[PDB]
Structure formats: C-alpha cells, structure tokens
Write a structure and sequence with these properties.
CATH topology of chain A: Macrophage Migration Inhibitory Factor
Largest sheet of chain A: 4 strands, mixed
Protein name (chains A, B, C): L-dopachrome isomerase
Number of domains of chain A: 1
CATH class of chain A: Alpha Beta
Enzyme class (chains A, B, C): isomerase
Order of helices and strands of chain A: EHEEEHEEE
CATH architecture of chain A: 2-Layer Sandwich
Number of strands of chain A: 7
Distance between the termini of chain A: 12 Å
Keywords (chains A, B, C): Cytokine, Isomerase, Secreted
Organism (chains A, B, C): Leishmania major
Helix content of chain A: 25-40%
Strand order of the largest sheet of chain A: 2-1-4-5
Oligomer: homotrimer
Subcellular location (chains A, B, C): Secreted
Radius of gyration of chain A: 14 Å
Strand content of chain A: 25-35%
Largest interface: A-B, 29 and 27 residues
Structural class of chain A: alpha/beta
CATH superfamily of chain A: Macrophage Migration Inhibitory Factor
Chain lengths: ~110, ~110, ~110
C-alpha cells in the first residue's frame, strides 16, 4: 500500500517513526499485507484550510491495489485518527482519511 | 471533499485565503455539500514541467466521495481555472483540474 | 496525463530536466498522447519510510484520463523505474509506480 500523511503542523523524527510503526501494524494486522510493503510519505507544515480555519488539521490518503475488505476501512480510520491525535495533537474532527485503489502498481520494475 | 492545489509559484496568505473562499463557495453552490467539509491543501513553489517549460503552472486535484453531478465538473473547472488565473497569474492553458472519487472517507473517526 | 514524482533524496535541475524528458517520451511513445500535455510535479527530500527504513526511496504516481492500454503499464513501470535509478540512484526495490485514472480532467478551462 501507500499512505501519504499531510498535516498542517511540523513533524519531527519521533512523530514520523511512531506513525510509521502504526501504519506498518495496520498494514499487517488490518489489511493483511506485508508491513515492509507499505510506502509512507510525510508532508508536514502543509498550509491547509478546513472548517473555516488554518488550525491543526490532517489528511491521510491510503492507496491499496485490490481495495479493502468489508470491515477494514472502519478499522483503519479508527486507528489512524487516534494515532494522528496521539502523535500530533490534531483533534479527530480535523482529521480526514481517504481511501483509494490504484489500477496498477509497480515495484522492483514489475507490476503486481 | 478534498481540494489539493499545486502551483509552481509562491503562494502568500492572501492568495491562500482567497482560493479557500472560492473552494468553499464551489463546494456549497456547485457540489451541494457543506462548505466547512472541504479540506484544502496548498503546495506552492512546486517544481513543475509542462508544455516544454517550468513556467507558472497549476494542478488542482478535486476528490469527492460519491463523485459529481452531470454539470458539476464543467462548472468547477471554469471557476477554479478563473480563480487560479486571478490569484496566481497562471494562464488557463497552464492549469489542469483533475477529478477523483475516493472509495471511502473517514472524518471524526468514522466513515461516511 | 499527470506524473507526480516523490523521492526522499534531493533533486536538482539536471535530474528534474532528465526525468521530464523521460516522462515526455513515455507519454508520446508508450501512452500515445501529446508529450506537451503531461504535467509533471517533483517533490524532493520527502521524508519517507519503506521496508523498515528511511533510505532513498521513490513513489511515482501516474494519472491518465481513459486509463491505459494492455501493455502500457508494464512498459511505463520498466522505463520509469530505470530512469529513477539512473537519475537518483534509488534502487529498483525501493521504487513504486502507481497508476490511476481521473473521472474528469480540465485544461484551458474546459474538460476533455
């Protein structure tokens, strides 16, 4: 999978590593995929606007070839929202989690 | 919805706030959704290349759960293109507007 | 099309121009579309995590209205992976290439 984390607040090494461990665990335990194959990007201090303000806010984008099992997006949204609040202090009503599925995905020069 | 604005030029506070007001109004008046629920990200001074040059250029990505009504993408493209030209000075033939629909979207810890 | 290049390493002018020439050529020769209509964004020094480390890694996202012909994603993944390794030194098993298709795309104020 790919998880892209956009937050309006600064990240630091601790936050990035803690979120990476959450995302690895979600990939293994919820999505049932190898934790070494979630590619994670972090985009901090992003100028954002939501709900009338530029206050701390987050958008996490999840991409997984093949989509998601029936109960998986509800679980990922709960876990990711709690982790962003824990690590970044961003409140749950300023966190979006969006889910996509690419048509194709290449790794190591070949498509899955 | 989510609107991500990538421009190759610098943004400033005025431009970000003016574009946020356009995007809020488009969300309410064209997409028929609550203006407080469009999450906006701004990505300025992005190194870009298009049509043979690195000259001022923009890519706006629009994401909306449930997709779009028949006439809505034509209206959003017209409004967003005019607003980017107004605020950033980027010419219309250097503006792309792309439209997607996530499979799922979480807010406040639960999916819509 | 749109090609967004996220790498964890710094880009410089040479690398950006060389990758833009590859992407133009792929758009013309593999996707069969006008090379002046691929919009490219570059996102360097992106904090990333993959396969247990923050070591040099890349995620390239390809978006094309209308999707892809049967053999095109395999060819694009091979060419783009080789180019990122050539230009950035990032090894093939730390390169993802993801493929999407927007619902709609606007250029010059009107949708295709």
């Amino acid at each position: 999978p790919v998880i892209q984390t956009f937050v309006s607040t600064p990240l630091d090494h601790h936050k990035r590593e803690n979120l990476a461990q959450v995302y690895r665990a979600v990939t293994r335990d919820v999505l049932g995929k190898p934790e070494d194959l979630v590619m994670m990007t972090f985009h901090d201090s992003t100028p954002m606007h939501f709900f009338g303000s530029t206050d701390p806010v987050a958008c996490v984008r999840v991409e997984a070839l093949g989509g998601y099992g029936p109960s998986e997006p509800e679980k990922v949204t709960s876990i990711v929202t709690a982790a962003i609040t824990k690590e970044c202090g961003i409140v749950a009503d300023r966190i979006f989690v969006l889910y996509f599925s690419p048509l194709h995905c290449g790794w190591n020069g070949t498509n899955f």
